[PDB]
Amino acid sequence: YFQGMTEYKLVVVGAGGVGKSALTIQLIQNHFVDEYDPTIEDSYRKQVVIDGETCLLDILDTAGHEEYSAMRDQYMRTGEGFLCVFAINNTKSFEDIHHYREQIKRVKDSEDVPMVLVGNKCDLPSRTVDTKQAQDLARSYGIPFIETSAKTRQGVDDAFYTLVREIRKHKE
Amino acid sequence: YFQGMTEYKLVVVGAGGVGKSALTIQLIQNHFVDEYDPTIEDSYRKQVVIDGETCLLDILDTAGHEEYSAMRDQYMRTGEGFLCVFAINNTKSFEDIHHYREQIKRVKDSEDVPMVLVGNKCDLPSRTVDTKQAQDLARSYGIPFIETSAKTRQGVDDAFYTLVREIRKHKE
Amino acid sequence: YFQGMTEYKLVVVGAGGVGKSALTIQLIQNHFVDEYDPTIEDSYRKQVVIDGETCLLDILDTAGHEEYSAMRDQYMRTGEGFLCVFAINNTKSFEDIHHYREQIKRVKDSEDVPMVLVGNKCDLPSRTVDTKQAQDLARSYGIPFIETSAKTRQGVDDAFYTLVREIRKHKE
Amino acid sequence: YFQGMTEYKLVVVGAGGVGKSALTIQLIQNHFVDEYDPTIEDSYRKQVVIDGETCLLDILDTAGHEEYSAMRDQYMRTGEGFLCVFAINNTKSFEDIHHYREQIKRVKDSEDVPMVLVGNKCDLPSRTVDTKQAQDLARSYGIPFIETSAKTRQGVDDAFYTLVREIRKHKEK
Amino acid sequence: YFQGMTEYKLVVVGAGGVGKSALTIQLIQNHFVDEYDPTIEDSYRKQVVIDGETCLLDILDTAGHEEYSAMRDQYMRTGEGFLCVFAINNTKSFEDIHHYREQIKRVKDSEDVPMVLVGNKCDLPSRTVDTKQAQDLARSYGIPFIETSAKTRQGVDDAFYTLVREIRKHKE
Amino acid sequence: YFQGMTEYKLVVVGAGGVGKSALTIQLIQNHFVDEYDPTIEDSYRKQVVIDGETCLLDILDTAGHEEYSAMRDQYMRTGEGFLCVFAINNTKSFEDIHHYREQIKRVKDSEDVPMVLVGNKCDLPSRTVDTKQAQDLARSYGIPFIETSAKTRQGVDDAFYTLVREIRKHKEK
Ligand SMILES: Nc1nc2c(ncn2[C@@H]2O[C@H](COP(=O)(O)OP(=O)(O)NP(=O)(O)O)[C@@H](O)[C@H]2O)c(=O)[nH]1
Ligand SMILES: Nc1nc2c(ncn2[C@@H]2O[C@H](COP(=O)(O)OP(=O)(O)NP(=O)(O)O)[C@@H](O)[C@H]2O)c(=O)[nH]1
Ligand SMILES: Nc1nc2c(ncn2[C@@H]2O[C@H](COP(=O)(O)OP(=O)(O)NP(=O)(O)O)[C@@H](O)[C@H]2O)c(=O)[nH]1
Ligand SMILES: Nc1nc2c(ncn2[C@@H]2O[C@H](COP(=O)(O)OP(=O)(O)NP(=O)(O)O)[C@@H](O)[C@H]2O)c(=O)[nH]1
Ligand SMILES: Nc1nc2c(ncn2[C@@H]2O[C@H](COP(=O)(O)OP(=O)(O)NP(=O)(O)O)[C@@H](O)[C@H]2O)c(=O)[nH]1
Ligand SMILES: Nc1nc2c(ncn2[C@@H]2O[C@H](COP(=O)(O)OP(=O)(O)NP(=O)(O)O)[C@@H](O)[C@H]2O)c(=O)[nH]1
Ligand SMILES: O=C(NC[C@@H]1COc2ccccc2O1)c1ccco1
Ligand SMILES: O=C(NC[C@@H]1COc2ccccc2O1)c1ccco1
Ligand SMILES: O=C(NC[C@@H]1COc2ccccc2O1)c1ccco1
Ligand SMILES: O=C(NC[C@@H]1COc2ccccc2O1)c1ccco1
Ligand SMILES: O=C(NC[C@@H]1COc2ccccc2O1)c1ccco1
Ligand SMILES: [Mg+2]
Ligand SMILES: [Mg+2]
Ligand SMILES: [Mg+2]
Ligand SMILES: [Mg+2]
Ligand SMILES: [Mg+2]
Ligand SMILES: [Mg+2]
């Protein structure tokens, strides 16, 4: 019997200051946060319809730099899909993506974990990471790539919905 | 790729005056039709969410007594699920059910066609068909039975949603 | 910041066979379950709007007779509000109500636990519990009383929504 | 040109105790009010979809017996459609309907005011007004008749939605 | 009597590669398609609310590279309104709008067909068609102009909704 | 007892041509108005959900330059919250903001009126008001600042929703 909507546990990861919180708050509250208030751990929920199916998104917004490592392992084990976020004006955040992806694969003991690569801050003019380099990286992982802006909303719904679609593909 | 909601083609059949139209209009318009205006053929649409899936119901309301028999065969071939309606104060309408069911199975060349047995007018005091007799008939067919009232709305959404659930079970 | 809708943890309690599951399934699925399948423990969820506020209902459907008593204490501690259900044609289930209420107050160590008294099966003709006696019982507890039918849907939404309203009053 | 949904100003009238408030509260809150708390004047709002059109219902719940008569005239002038409610177990409330209808036509200075006749408390066994008599009365006025119960919800949405449909028919003539 | 929502048959036309499919998929899926997969003929549906009226959009996505087909004329004649799409960085696509407008008038056998002029890819730096030139063209036809980006979503809902508004104006 | 959704009376003010109407029509109709049709006074409504609470926005779109002054005073008294709009390519419109805020405070006889500063036309290239100057101004007033574009929709929902959030904060003090 149907016991209520499907829930998806989504985790947003990436380096400090890339816009993990701003992405999530834009999704939930339709609000752009201009301030930089570093996150420890915050959880949000939103019911949405994707490809005709109602679902409840449970979104965990993580800290760029996780001090205690057992807490990080716990959210990686609980997460069903991951947004791996870098900022298109921060080359170091892009170089860090490989580390986040390896950490997730290690903790979940899986090679095929639903993930989407997200290049955020696409509204800003001083781009240091080229679209082609990110697309190549995503292709090498077999995952989608989406450019976003938490300020203009470009790609925000698409990033989260794409991740749900990746989870659903993996569940069949 | 998703191109739009799933559509379900539902056909409402049964003897003259059992409340086929009244059931459908209660579903679509939240309106009870007190008048008895015999139907020739009418089609209705409604988008609903059932078990978290969005769907488009295409509902064909049929005549109690079909003049052209080729037109009847055509809607039987086209329909994916059937509500077989009798009135709980009309014994003849209940005895007629087996004819509608045989016609449908013949045309579809199948013993497992999605169907729901509907005992309508359950608000009226003059009952001549017992719940147990209808339940036994439905059990013999392997289909659900639901008592309805187009006037009180008892069972109306449930009849249609149950039929969609029967179609989905058959498709998988 | 708002992190998504408010969640309410609702627990449905009462004697065996009074319609705990049937009420919950009518709420969630718009479906009347005619079969009597005794419950061990089932959980359901639904998003609804009550008094203009969006909320997520988490509903725990319990067994009439709880064997292991630590498991019962655990759901009573976790529940924020309780529907105490009897059947209007079952005097014993009505006389039992005070036991359920005492068990809840004992475990929660409180005299002011959000609760609603529910008299189910109000569609049936064989009534043995008078509405006035139920209202008097509810008045003695300081809680609302609602007559319901899981078959007709009378009062079903009202029972759950009223319970949410009781929870909100207690939280403020 | 479109400035937001269409608004319909609905007024609920009828004798004391027929269930005007209970109908409205069932519509708005999905709650049956068992208590009898006499109304002075209350206003409620709900956004609904009727025949594919989104609309905002502004509903004025009136007192059975109106003290100040200028205030009654004011809501009758402002109202676009009226639910005229009686209780099916209260013959006197049914006999009163013609007075409410006449008062509305007088104030609005019109013979063609959108209205629906509502026979409430249809869940109760003690019926004293026959459906044939109510149907005849409604036919004589050229308006719909609907039996309702604020307790079971029978006919509640239908009464209000039917009234909106009557208003729309009148606006298109 | 109301039998369910109004349906509008929309057709999206324009030169190869202008973003007809990308616009439609952004509408339906909230997804930007980066790949260029040439279309032959694809159909989508979506229920939306426009000016307070619920409607069902039936959307036909066409080929931009297609020699003369009787089969093309046949599907175009089902259209009630047309999005005529060019890319703001492709002057030839803008000059081709005259050909699509003549094709539509020919197939519909009418001078007054609901249409909207859509200038897509407004996010790109390589603009060759100025806003004022497109506005002047649209004014000459007596139709609206909307600038869009299937990547940012600028103007996507507005293009389709505007077309529905044009259809409604024509029907009254 | 709940009688239907809460209504918020929002007023959009600012110099002529800054995009007051364009913002409102983007919110209501999802439509970008490219034409410049100067407003006299128009009212719009929209039901929205903000922070899980359903509400009805009643939005008054005002004229840049209000000729008869009693009509302006009346909407300022009635309004619960104000969007103060300038265009990021029009320095004069930004210099006007302080005066619109003072006019609102004078009419309402209060120092603490819910308001949001809106910098519109952020899609256009010829910016003359820098983000930092607007943020500083907003900070000096203790109000939020949001950059918007009625063309791209950037910030449109956020401006209106933020204003409702400011009204709710003020009602809870
Ligand atoms: N222009 C622009 N600024 C952005 C965007 N996303 C985030 N920002 C800004 O970048 C800063 C950091 O954003 P924030 O959400 O807090 O980043 P975070 O990744 O959650 N940081 P942490 O790891 O400390 O929790 C903030 O000043 C924010 O406004 C964007 O897409 N565009
Ligand atoms: N009391 C009550 N009356 C009902 C109910 N359903 C239908 N009726 C009434 O029964 C009569 C016949 O209803 P109708 O829907 O037209 O029947 P039908 O099966 O569509 N007739 P046909 O086959 O000629 O199209 C109408 O007067 C209607 O008001 C019900 O559930 N309860
Ligand atoms: N007529 C009618 N029958 C009802 C209603 N509610 C429940 N029933 C019936 O009463 C029986 C028991 O219902 P059920 O929901 O299983 O009760 P329960 O309280 O969950 N049983 P348990 O404690 O064993 O889990 C079933 O046959 C069901 O159809 C009602 O409102 N009216
Ligand atoms: N059984 C049943 N009782 C009803 C129904 N509608 C109203 N009642 C009851 O009848 C009483 C009067 O209802 P109420 O809504 O206050 O009537 P009213 O017409 O608003 N009275 P007034 O004009 O004084 O404001 C209440 O006790 C209420 O529970 C109904 O449909 N069925
Ligand atoms: N940057 C940008 N690229 C776009 C935009 N719309 C479409 N594209 C890109 O342009 C290419 C062609 O788009 P597509 O939608 O397939 O074009 P079409 O008009 O459907 N082509 P056909 O007629 O062959 O079906 C794709 O690579 C797509 O990503 C847009 O608004 N901006
Ligand atoms: N590019 C761009 N143009 C805009 C934007 N907002 C408004 N405009 C344009 O600026 C002009 C004025 O907008 P309008 O909404 O009428 O301004 P207003 O503040 O309501 N004027 P008034 O005070 O006379 O009523 C219009 O041509 C409109 O298209 C925007 O965000 N971006
Ligand atoms: O709810 C929280 N975290 C608990 C878990 C961890 O992993 C999760 C992974 C994905 C989504 C939700 C998760 O929820 C939380 C922290 C701070 C506030 O809420
Ligand atoms: O719609 C109609 N017929 C076409 C077909 C028939 O079978 C169907 C079966 C189920 C649902 C729709 C159907 O539509 C129709 C004739 C008269 C009024 O509507
Ligand atoms: O859901 C479950 N338990 C977790 C908790 C306990 O207390 C609850 C109290 C109220 C509502 C839900 C509850 O859910 C559960 C076990 C087995 C099936 O569902
Ligand atoms: O709301 C009130 N009156 C003002 C007007 C009158 O006519 C109306 C007609 C229909 C809907 C609302 C109306 O509102 C009111 C007084 C007391 C409580 O509410
Ligand atoms: O609606 C109007 N005025 C009445 C009032 C005034 O202040 C208001 C402030 C905010 C929202 C609605 C208001 O509406 C109106 C005149 C012209 C067009 O609409
Ligand atoms: Mg953060
Ligand atoms: Mg019929
Ligand atoms: Mg049970
Ligand atoms: Mg009252
Ligand atoms: Mg294509
Ligand atoms: Mg204006």
- Residue F89 belongs to domain with CATH number: 3.40.50.300
CA distance A163 to B123: 49
Number of domains in chain A: 1
State whether the beta carbon of F39 lies less than 6 angstroms from ligand 6: yes
Strands A41-50 and A53-62: antiparallel
CA distance B26 to E20: 40
Cβ atoms within 10 Å, residue F73: 15
F34 contacts E158? CB cut-off 8 A: no
Q: What is the DSSP letter of F39?
A: -
Cα D29 from chain centroid (whole Å)? 17
Cα A131 from chain centroid (whole Å)? 17
Q: This structure's resolution (angstroms)?
A: 1.7
Identify the residue whose C-alpha is closest to ligand 3 atom 8: C19
- In the numeric block, which tokens belong to residue A137? 């990286």
CA distance F9 to E47: 30
Per CB-CB distance under 8 Å, the chain D contacts of B29 are 51, 161
Identify the residue whose C-alpha is closest to ligand 9 atom 1: C43
CA distance B148 to E150: 48
What is the sign of the dihedral through the CA atoms of F67, F69, F70 and F72? positive
How far does residue B23's CA lie from ligand 2's centre (Å)? Answer: 8
Burial of A78 (0-12, 13-18, 19+ CB in 10 A): exposed
- Long-range CB pairs of C27-32 (<8 Å, 24+ gap) are C27/C59, C27/C156, C27/C157, C27/C160, C28/A2, C28/A3, C28/A4, C28/C59, C29/A1, C29/A2, C29/B51, C29/B161, C30/B157, C30/B158, C30/B161, C31/B158, C31/B161, C31/B162, C32/B146, C32/B155, C32/B158, C32/C150, C32/C151
- Long-range CB pairs of D156-159 (<8 Å, 24+ gap) are D156/D23, D156/D26, D156/D27, D157/B30, D157/D27, D157/D48, D158/B30, D158/B31, D158/B32, D159/D23, D159/D83, D159/D116, D159/D118
Q: Residue A49, annotated ligand binder?
A: no
Q: Which of C30, C34, C153 minimises the CB distance to B161?
A: C30
How far does residue E32's CA lie from ligand 5's centre (Å)? Answer: 9
CA distance B85 to B145: 10
Give the type of residue at C85: V
Conformational region of residue C51, where left means phi above 0, alpha means psi within -120 to 50, and beta covers everything else: left
A157 contacts E152? CB cut-off 8 A: no
Give the type of residue at C156: V
Strands E6-14 and E81-87: parallel
What residue has token string 């128009």?
A: F42
State whether the beta carbon of D36 lies less than 6 angstroms from ligand 4: yes
End-to-end CA distance of chain C: 19
Strands D53-62 and D6-14: parallel
Per CB-CB distance under 8 Å, the chain E contacts of A51 are 29
User: CB-based contacts of F64: which residues, under 8 Å, 6+ apart?
Assistant: F14, F15, F16, F17, F18, F20, F38, F39
End-to-end CA distance of chain D: 21
How far does residue F140's CA lie from ligand 11's centre (Å)? Answer: 29
- In the numeric block, which tokens belong to residue C7? 């969640």
Identify whether the C-beta of residue A45 lies closer than 8 Å to the C-beta of residue A57: yes
Conformational region of residue F4, where left means phi above 0, alpha means psi within -120 to 50, and beta covers everything else: left
Any bridge partners for residue A38, and if so which? none
D54 contacts E2? CB cut-off 8 A: no
Helix (H, G, I), strand (E, B) or coil at F11: strand
| Host domain of residue B40 | 1-172
State whether the beta carbon of A101 lies less than 6 angstroms from ligand 1: no
CA distance E87 to E102: 19
CA distance F87 to F122: 8
CA distance E112 to E169: 11
- Rounded to the nearest 10 degrees, what angle do helices B91-108 and B69-78 cross at? 70
- Long-range CB pairs of F35-38 (<8 Å, 24+ gap) are F38/F63, F38/F64
- Distance, in angstroms, between B44 CA and closest chain E CA? 5
Residues written for chain F:
173
Q: What is the DSSP letter of B162?
A: H
Strand ranges in chain B using DSSP code E only, listed in sequence order: 6-14, 41-50, 53-62, 81-87, 115-120, 145-147
User: CB-based contacts of A89: which residues, under 8 Å, 6+ apart?
Assistant: A121, A124, A126, A127, A128, A129
Identify the residue whose C-alpha is closest to ligand 5 atom 2: E121
CA distance D52 to C151: 29
User: CB-based contacts of A157: which residues, under 8 Å, 6+ apart?
Assistant: A27, E30
A29 contacts F51? CB cut-off 8 A: yes
Q: Which of F4, F5, F52 minimises the CB distance to C2?
A: F52
CA distance B157 to B33: 16
Q: Which of E3, E5, E25 minimises the CB distance to B43?
A: E3
CA distance E65 to E38: 9
Strands E41-50 and E6-14: unpaired
CA distance A40 to A45: 17
Strands E53-62 and E81-87: unpaired
Ligand 8 neighbours (beta carbon < 6 A): B 9, 11, 41-43, 58, 60, 75, 78-79
A28 contacts C4? CB cut-off 8 A: yes
